[PDB]
């Protein structure tokens, strides 16, 4: 009955880009499932901070470029779970088509798993050079200033991670909108195992 999931969340941009975390996501982040929250920055306001604090007993936050009066937030953070070191930062200009730049940040923090909050607000993950890279997207679906494909809009998302030993299971939660305004939570699972 122990909480066992790590919430990875970021790029909320409340209130300047978005007003709220979607109610369908708040339902999923109810008390007692999440053991730790990694927040990758850009909250930005106090109400949003207080809400994230309420999700879990262990909130670890890094500073985003829009968290302007946030001197008490570190620019990077590293948590250890099982045999894995998990580092994170806002890293808003990091991109997966330049994976060596992400790798250099992972080697700098010296971690197995690197989470970053790329400014494109697209969820993605990939494995590279025996490491795992995770961008949770924007949990509010905040607009991006990056280049979107023609019919593309930002998809609200966050991730939950289950770490056991050298293995990490990642669940991504996306609020996908249909052509008719309807929407639904869509879940996908990804697995990473650190090579021996």
From TrEMBL:
The keyword Protein transport applies. It holds the Pfam family Metallophos_2. GO terms for biological process: protein transport; retrograde transport, endosome to Golgi. Keywords: Protein transport, Transport. InterPro entries: Calcineurin-like_PHP_lpxH, Metallo-depent_PP-like, Phosphodiesterase_MJ0936/Vps29, Vps29. Residues 5-145 form the Calcineurin-like phosphoesterase domain. PANTHER family: VACUOLAR SORTING PROTEIN VPS29. Belongs to the VPS29 family. This is Vacuolar protein sorting-associated protein 29. It comes from Chaetomium thermophilum (strain DSM 1495 / CBS 144.50 / IMI 039719).
